[PDB]
Paper text:
Muscle contraction requires a shortening of the sarcomere, the basic contractile unit of muscle, caused by the sliding of interdigitating thick and thin filaments. Here we present the molecular architecture of native cardiac sarcomeres in the relaxed state, determined by cryo-electron tomography. To obtain a near-native sample suitable for focused-ion-beam milling and cryo-ET analysis, we relaxed demembranated mouse cardiac myofibrils in the presence of EGTA, dextran and mavacamten. Our cryo-ET structure of the sarcomere in the relaxed state together with our previously determined structures of the sarcomere in the rigor state provide insights into muscle architecture and its molecular complexity, intricacy of regulation and sophistication.
The tomograms showed that the thick filaments were indeed in the OFF state, as defined by the absence of myosin binding to thin filaments. Using subtomogram averaging, we could determine the structure of the cardiac thin filament with tropomyosin in the blocked state (myosin-binding site occluded) at 8.2 Å resolution and the structure of the relaxed thick filament. We observed the presence of several cMyBP-C links in the C zone, suggesting that the N-terminal region can indeed interact with the thin filament. Despite our efforts, subtomogram averaging did not resolve any clear arrangement of the N-terminal region on the thin filament, indicating a high heterogeneity in these interactions, in agreement with previous reconstructions from isolated components. Our segmentation exposed the presence of a tether formed by 3 to 4 domains that blend in the signal of the thin filament with 43-nm intervals and high degrees of flexibility. Thus, the flexibility of the links can probably accomodate the mismatch of the 37-nm actin repeat in thin filaments and the 43-nm cMyBP-C repeat in thick filaments. Of note, the thin filament with bound N-terminal cMyBP-C domains appears in the OFF state, suggesting that cMyBP-C, at physiological phosphorylation levels and in the absence of myosin cross-bridges, is not a thin filament activator.
Numbering used by the authors:
A (entry chain I): 6 to 377
B (entry chain H), C (entry chain G): 92 to 151
Write the structure that this text describes.
């Protein structure tokens, strides 16, 4: 059978590999570096485009750009570079031999779904392809046809009620606030403590810090009080040039913005609130199988202690005769990619692919007839 | 010479050993997580069954 | 001397980096282990309670 490349379009990490395997085989940063100055390398070759880990090692001399900003492809040129690198550098295979599965947000722009369909088929010459909602794949990785997924990426958070494998198009909710924003916010609040960070390279350390040291508090006022009353809510981090910095209440404050969007000046409601409001758009006999399967997904959900917080919050908004229970997969950061690996290796799914012939007949439009 | 050489060599012996130990620590983390995955999936299946039973019992 | 010294210095830097990554993998392993232990304790409790209910359900 044809080996399908599953490529998760994560906004701060690419996750890529082959279908039928239990885990991604390449996990690298979504970063394209291009030179700030030319002349840097003399006696050695210069290139102008570095991608992923190659770019990461050269960060000092590169201008980093993100291909995907807030789950939205913002530059077609940087999306292409990521792709060129995925196939030829990272997996070292011809894409033209391998069908492609691409991941997307709910309500991912149609003009974008098309430019993605077109770019894959004309330049890479893919034999077949498909595009699928991130949360639907994470639900298949959770072994379920039906449930509501809180998917919080490295850039967007969605609440996605799904039923018999279809995401409910009137009931889904979105929040632009997650891992990308979270770094920029963390950096702000550290400047406020007097650990000013103004350089973007230092920003990436702040990113790493965030992933390692942030934790979801179970009670925001009680932990805040604890940090005000004692310095036991602080963890040290040694910067790689030396210099020991102390990260305080910023640890739980940073992700606190997910529950209270007003802290960054939004009119948006919180991730627990949009969970509750999303299920309340659904019919009562499916509210049962939706509430019974509240699933966490994506990189932002890997902060410890999140389940007890989300269990709390949802039981407080929701009536005490729906079964409330948080499902947190063992490696929830990958559950989109794992769900794509499952879906692309089902014998029933092989009828669904966009073929090169259907693209030649209808142009990039074909995704809006084959994908749902 | 000899001291700088002996110090290097042991430093490499030590590095080699630290990489071996890193792979071992990595393996063990994987064995723990897998086990952790198996218990977790058994806990969850029992829970879903339990809640259906608390309800079946209330319903009955 | 110098060449050997430059090789030793490189060897030392590599050893430090491996030891930090190793300490991290140990910590992550310790954490999987903790995670696992709470999960096992829940698993037991959900099972007993699902079983306890199986008796009560039969009775109703």
């Amino acid at each position: 059978e044809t080996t399908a490349l599953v490529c998760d379009n994560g906004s701060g990490l690419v996750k890529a590999g082959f279908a039928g395997d239990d885990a991604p085989r390449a996990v690298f940063p979504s970063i394209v570096g291009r030179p700030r100055h030319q002349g840097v390398m003399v006696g050695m070759g210069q290139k102008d485009s570095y991608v992923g880990d190659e770019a990461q090692s050269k960060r000092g001399i590169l201008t980093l750009k993100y291909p995907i900003e807030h789950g939205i492809i913002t530059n077609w040129d940087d999306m292409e570079k990521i792709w060129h690198h995925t196939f030829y550098n990272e997996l070292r295979v011809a894409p033209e031999e391998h069908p492609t599965l691409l991941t997307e947000a709910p309500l991912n722009p149609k003009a974008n779904r098309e430019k993605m369909t077109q770019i894959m088929f004309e330049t890479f010459n893919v034999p077949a392809m498909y595009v699928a909602i991130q949360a639907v794949l994470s639900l298949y990785a959770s072994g379920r046809t039906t449930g509501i997924v809180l998917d919080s990426g490295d850039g967007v958070t969605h609440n996605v009620p799904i039923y018999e494998g279809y995401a409910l198009p009137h009931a889904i909710m979105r929040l632009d606030l997650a891992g990308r924003d979270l770094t920029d916010y963390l950096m702000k609040i550290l400047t406020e403590r007097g650990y000013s960070f103004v350089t973007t390279a230092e920003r990436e350390i702040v990113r790493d810090i965030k992933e390692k040291l942030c934790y979801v508090a179970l009670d925001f006022e009680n932990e805040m009080a604890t940090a005000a009353s004692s310095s036991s809510l602080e963890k040290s981090y040694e910067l790689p040039d030396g210099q020991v910095i102390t990260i305080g209440n910023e640890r739980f404050r940073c992700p606190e913005t997910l529950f209270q969007p007003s802290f960054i000046g939004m009119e948006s409601a919180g991730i627990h609130e949009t969970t509750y409001n999303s299920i309340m758009k659904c019919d009562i006999d499916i509210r049962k199988d939706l509430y019974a399967n509240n699933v966490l997904s994506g990189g932002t959900t890997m902060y410890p202690g999140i389940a007890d917080r989300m269990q709390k919050e949802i039981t407080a908004l929701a009536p005490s005769t729906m079964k409330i229970k948080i499902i947190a997969p063992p490696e929830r950061k990958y559950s989109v990619w794992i769900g794509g690996s499952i879906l692309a290796s089902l014998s029933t799914f092989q009828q669904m692919w966009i073929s090169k012939q259907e693209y030649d007949e209808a142009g990039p439009s074909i995704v809006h007839r084959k994908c749902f | 010479i000899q001291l700088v050489e002996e110090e290097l060599d042991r430093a490499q012996e030590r590095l080699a050993t630290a990489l071996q130990k890193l792979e071992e620590a990595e393996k063990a983390a994987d064995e723990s997580e897998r086990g952790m995955k198996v218990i977790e999936s058994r806990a969850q299946k029992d829970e879903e069954k339990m809640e259906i039973q608390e309800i079946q019992l209330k319903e009955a």
